[PDB]
Design a protein around this ligand. Structure first.
Ligand SMILES: NCCC[C@H](N)CC(=O)NCCC[C@H](N)CC(=O)NCCC[C@H](N)CC(=O)N[C@@H]1[C@H](O)[C@@H](OC(N)=O)[C@@H](CO)O[C@H]1NC1=N[C@@H]2C(=O)NC[C@@H](O)[C@H]2N1
Lengths: 52, 117, 104, 62, 88
RNA sequence: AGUAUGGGAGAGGAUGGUAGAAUUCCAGGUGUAGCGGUGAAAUGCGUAGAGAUCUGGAGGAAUACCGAUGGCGAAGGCAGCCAUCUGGCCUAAUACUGACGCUGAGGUACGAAAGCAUGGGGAGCAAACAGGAUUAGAUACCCUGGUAGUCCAUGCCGUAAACGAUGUCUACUAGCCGUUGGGGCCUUUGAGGCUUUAGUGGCGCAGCUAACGCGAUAAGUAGACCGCCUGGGGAGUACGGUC
């Protein structure tokens, strides 16, 4: 998963903008790490908001 | 003198006090009230009842400017946020929305030391 | 050499110089050596949060292969260009040529 | 960021709003930010939390 | 950093037989090349202690292999140290 | 025991950029008597206009959520994102060298925090110190302030309950349930089920222990080398010496 796939990136983001834990989303640890990296890159690219 | 239909209520509710300020948009204040301004000195300044009495005072003061609907923002872990938001409806405004805007550091400055009471 | 992926955010007021800047950068990469596997113009998009008191920006994606000197001059040019408000450079293994999402 | 409905009552709005806030869990961070917690204390607390989590898991499996 | 071509060149230059990669001559030549290459890195980054540990391990390994080669065959040892310019 | 070739995970190290949240300060608009603080108060701030609220600017330090009995590192320790330089580890199959090994007195390298030297920086916090409370007294705990220091560059210091209070290396000895990084096999379509390997956890047979407890990550069964102990104080002290 990469930062450009905004639709999937939003599936793991709360309404505030916080990353959803793997214990809630049922994801693998490596996939969760890649997801967090992609989300942090997309926030920098102003593709998704940092907060709210 | 100035008329405005839509405004925002700000409820800054700490553990020692609660300030309710009624402003119009773009953040220009119109009326404000605090628990200290209605008696309630010292420790009693933090009770929910004082927050309530400050809230109706502020609402009635803003009624002169004459806003019928307003949006509410609450910041702080105060005990008087319940009463402050409730009293505005009793005064008679229409609450369009209510949100929490308590600022959260992203691991910024070091907070003060722990109290060894 | 090394494959790099570059995302540039151009000021919406300079939207009609983006072709000139892109061609200049492509020419520099080519004269060094360079294989521009991919180049996409995502268009003018709204920003999730305002940057420099701006709410829209032009999005450009490039995938290049280049050396250290090409990378250094490219990054320095990006820094000194005022039309570019934010750029992201990430190194990748493999050359990516397929069309990406947001190309619409 | 709770938006009231058209005929949405005030008390129902307050309620829906502050367990929207309870779901958000901002007040936990606000409580955390009152005093500085030393790293040794933080690690001890996290270790205790992990132990409690594991003991809860075994009971819920049984 | 050295690349596959450089390592293959060293192996080809110092091999004792076809497909020889484990001989002490080849191992010592590779270690010497790596140490000489890392000298430049440690000039620029004086405080990279964590990498200097790996450098020290390389030095120790080369010394042990040289001692073993000297024990086995003196002439090969002298030839190797002369070829690589090592003082001992 | 080691070498070459493919693949993989990681807050491992060094350098330089950059992003967002927040605190403080400055300026301006709206606005007017309080704010702040405590068990309760007081010191303190404010009518030359605070606090609150909105807009802009300056600077420093740290990186919410992810986050985990998770990961990496010899240990000390290491968390935003990006680039450059760089160490180690895991995993498959052939190929290669042919005991090249283990430990290690002296020696040497690294080594939290505080502290020291020279020069910068200084938002927040805060030894010393000032004032306000409490108290029989307060020298303290509580409150309002606040300097070293905490930060950076170049060096020194070499100490911690530096702990798993458990030296390193090797082989062997029931099982059951988790989790991280890989290899293989099987279903049959994509997600599951068996194994195997290197880590990281919870129980537990035998065995061991004064007991508590340990129990393939041994404190069991054996081997190699090193360090250390010999009642409590005097005492990690005096003298001499090295730094
Ligand atoms: N090649 C091998 C590689 C090894 C690897 N590197 C590390 C490793 O594997 N080491 C073996 C395990 C030894 C272990 N360290 C000894 C032990 O565990 N206790 C020490 C003996 C004290 C006493 N006899 C028992 C005791 O008081 N128990 C308490 C108790 O059960 C409970 O507390 C309370 N109040 O009821 C619990 C929760 O607080 O805490 C325990 N106490 C503790 N739990 C902690 C823990 O396990 N560790 C760190 C420290 O924190 C420990 N203290």
């Amino acid at each position: 998963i990469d930062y450009k796939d905004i639709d999937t990136l939003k599936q793991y983001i709360t309404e505030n903008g916080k990353i959803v834990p793997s214990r809630i989303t049922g994801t693998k640890a490596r996939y969760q790490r890649q997801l967090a990296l992609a989300i942090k890159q997309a926030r920098y690219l102003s593709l998704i908001p940092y907060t709210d | 003198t100035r008329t405005v239909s839509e405004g925002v209520a700000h409820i800054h509710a700490s553990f020692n006090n609660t300030i309710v300020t009624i402003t119009d948009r773009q953040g220009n204040a119109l009326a404000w009230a605090t628990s200290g301004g209605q008696g309630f000195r010292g420790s009693r300044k933090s009770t929910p009842f004082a927050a309530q009495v400050a809230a109706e005072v502020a609402g009635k003061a803003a009624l002169d400017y004459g806003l019928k609907n307003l949006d509410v923002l609450v910041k702080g872990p105060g005990p008087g946020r319940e009463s402050a938001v409730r009293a505005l409806g009793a005064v008679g405004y229409k609450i369009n929305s209510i949100t929490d805007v308590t600022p959260i550091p992203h691991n910024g400055c070091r907070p003060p030391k722990k109290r060894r009471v | 050499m090394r494959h790099y992926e570059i995302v540039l955010l151009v000021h919406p007021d300079q939207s009609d110089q983006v072709v000139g800047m892109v061609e200049r950068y492509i020419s520099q990469i080519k004269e060094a050596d360079g294989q521009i596997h991919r180049l996409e113009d995502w268009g003018r998009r709204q920003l999730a949060y305002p940057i420099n008191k701006i709410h829209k920006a032009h999005y450009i994606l490039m995938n290049v292969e280049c050396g250290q000197s090409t990378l250094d001059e490219l990054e320095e040019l990006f820094r000194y260009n005022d039309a570019i408000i934010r750029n992201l450079i990430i190194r990748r293994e493999h050359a990516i040529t397929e069309e990406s999402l947001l190309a619409k | 960021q709770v938006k009231l409905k058209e005929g949405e009552p005030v008390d129902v709005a307050i309620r829906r709003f502050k367990r929207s806030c309870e779901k958000a869990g901002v007040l936990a961070d606000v409580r955390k930010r009152e005093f500085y917690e030393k790293p040794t204390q933080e690690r001890k607390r996290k270790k205790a939390a992990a132990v409690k989590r594991y003991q809860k898991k075994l009971a819920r499996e049984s | 950093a050295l690349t596959n071509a450089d390592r293959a060149e060293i192996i080809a230059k110092f091999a004792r037989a076809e497909n020889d990669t484990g001989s002490p001559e080849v191992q010592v030549a590779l270690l010497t090349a790596q140490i000489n290459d890392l000298q430049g890195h440690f000039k620029a980054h004086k405080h990279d202690h964590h990498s200097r540990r790996g450098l020290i391990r390389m030095v120790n390994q080369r010394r042990k292999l040289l001692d073993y080669l000297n024990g086995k065959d003196h002439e090969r040892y002298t030839a190797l140290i002369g070829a690589l310019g090592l003082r001992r």
